[PDB]
Amino acid sequence: KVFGRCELAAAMKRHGLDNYRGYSLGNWVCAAKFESNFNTQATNRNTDGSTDYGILQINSRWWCNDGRTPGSRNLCNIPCSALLSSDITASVNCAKKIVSDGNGMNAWVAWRNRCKGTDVQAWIRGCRL
Numbered sequence: 001k002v003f004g005r006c007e008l009a010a011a012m013k014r015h016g017l018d019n020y021r022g023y024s025l026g027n028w029v030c031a032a033k034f035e036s037n038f039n040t041q042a043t044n045r046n047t048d049g050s051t052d053y054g055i056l057q058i059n060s061r062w063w064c065n066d067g068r069t070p071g072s073r074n075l076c077n078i079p080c081s082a083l084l085s086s087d088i089t090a091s092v093n094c095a096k097k098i099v100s101d102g103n104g105m106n107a108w109v110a111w112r113n114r115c116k117g118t119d120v121q122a123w124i125r126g127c128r129l
């Protein structure tokens, strides 16, 4: 599923991400934009052989199992394929664990490089939330 911007903002809001660990909703929408272009089916292979999955490009190196990332962990206790669903529940629940891990949203390289410190409120402008 390719979410509309406000569609995803509303989905993220109802799933409890607005100000989760102090990150306003626009931060999450911005991260999703640059990680996946709002596409739940986004996947990308990393140089180390792990793969990023879904709307927030969650990495099999640590967070999910895909059976093809040797020596990795599965800290969200989920198949990586669950992170590709049209329903963002699994991705959101796992994201909550990731952002609580120590470095906050810096865990998402695209957030650090493209969202952090910017006017992220613009990402939820005009949205019915």
Ligand SMILES: [Cl-]
Residues within 6 Å of the ligand: 005, 033
């Ligand atoms: Cl957009």
Ligand SMILES: [Cl-]
Residues within 6 Å of the ligand: 024, 025, 026, 027, 120, 121, 122, 124
């Ligand atoms: Cl915001």
Ligand SMILES: [Cl-]
Residues within 6 Å of the ligand: 021, 022, 103, 104, 105
């Ligand atoms: Cl933080």
